[PDB]
Symmetry: C3
Subunit: 179 residues, 3 copies
């Protein structure tokens, strides 16, 4: 599995997708509807490429899709890790005010989902690429949630990078192999 990271509008997916290529059958795992839509949008016009790309919207129990029942000719494109987190944050936090949240415990649950993902990735014969974002080279947020989100988001990326076979840092659309 290869991890692709970068800042906002750094061109990481384009590269992440470049990573994939000509493996006719591909699975796109989208963390937001917003993302599941842009894809199934180009896969109606894209005839263009001989690729039979498939989407699915999901940020929970990845082991379900990132299966081992997939051929090693198949590839997987997952995007994006951070939106996964944010989502998890919201649901984990429940119907409560972010002011009254158990950030140490929430962090744990996310880790879990992270371990599962990391786990399912080991048992999948197919190529799996994960897109993430770098959100810690700025200044310390004023907002509370934001401060946490930043930390947690950063620690999660550490796990991934480590379980990653390859690690790509994209800057201004220029991919840099760090691992």
């Amino acid at each position: 599995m290869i991890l692709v990271t970068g800042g906002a509008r750094s061109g990481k997916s384009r590269h992440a997708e470049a990573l994939i290529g000509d493996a006719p059958q591909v699975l796109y795992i989208a963390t937001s509807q917003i993302l599941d839509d842009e894809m199934a949008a180009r896969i109606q016009h894209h005839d263009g490429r001989p690729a039979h790309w498939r989407t699915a919207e999901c940020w929970r129990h990845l082991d379900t899709l990132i299966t081992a029942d997939l051929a090693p000719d198949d590839a997987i494109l997952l995007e994006c890790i951070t939106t996964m987190v944010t989502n998890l944050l919201f649901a984990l936090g429940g119907e409560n005010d972010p002011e009254q949240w158990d950030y140490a415990a929430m962090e744990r649950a996310i880790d879990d989902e992270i371990q599962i993902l990391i786990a399912a990735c080991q048992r999948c014969p197919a190529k799996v690429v994960l897109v993430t974002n770098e959100v810690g080279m700025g200044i310390v947020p004023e907002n509370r949630l934001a401060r946490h989100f930043r930390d947690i988001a950063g620690r999660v990326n550490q796990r991934l990078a480590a379980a990653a076979d390859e690690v790509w840092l994209v800057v201004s659309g220029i991919g840099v192999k760090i691992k």
Copy 2:
């Protein structure tokens, strides 16, 4: 052309300058007044020591005007800064209306057009062009609607220049990294 990116106080401007090197004729294009006044002051000092000719010009629109074909391959051009140019255009394009009421999609194309003119005006140019830009998307998503947009626009503007650059440098803590 050459692209130098990095953060605020990364020391890219000092890196870029070193890139130009021992050039005879150097034109510094400031995308803002401070930058211009800034360098206008420097030159009055290194003027006597060195034996290279430096000069400045404030322009952040229609750079093809300065990035011409009648320039010598020995000549050089330092442009600073691309991100201020961007914001500059945003205000101009936005005119006299409240930023809320702005059509960011449209302004964006206008900006794209503006970049295409420099990308292409860099292509025909014989002189060494150096472009100094900024990285601004490795932090948290801004609440301020304008910033959010700028953040994006500026990220996409960069991708484009980078793809046009023959060489790309990443300056961290003054340390340069050739990533292209």
Copy 3:
């Protein structure tokens, strides 16, 4: 000395630790309580699963008092974090007065003057010196006045230490990148 940088929760200290490796005696200089409060706890837990002897201390001023010319080439020093040290100085230099009445220019000098000491100190210090800092200039410009300055001063400091470092590392998502 050696410099380590990257973002917030980038895995910079771990790398910092894996950089000293097996140095017999190690001294951790925390620029904050919390920084010290953890290293300590973390030491206690590994004090038996690690031959090397680790010790802690808090300091962010007159570091030449900790970094001396009487240490062994085998001795190590892991000072963390530079940026927290700059914050600390600011408040201390500004002090009683509201930040909006702050003279940043004058405060920048005092600060640098603190950087040299540490810098000059590492030169003298015969032991392996490792410094950790953060990259805080890759985001959008801050509205908060004091922040704006801090980012600025912080980048300029990173440059000072970077120039003097012998090795420079960049940490991204746990993975290190030797840029110098």
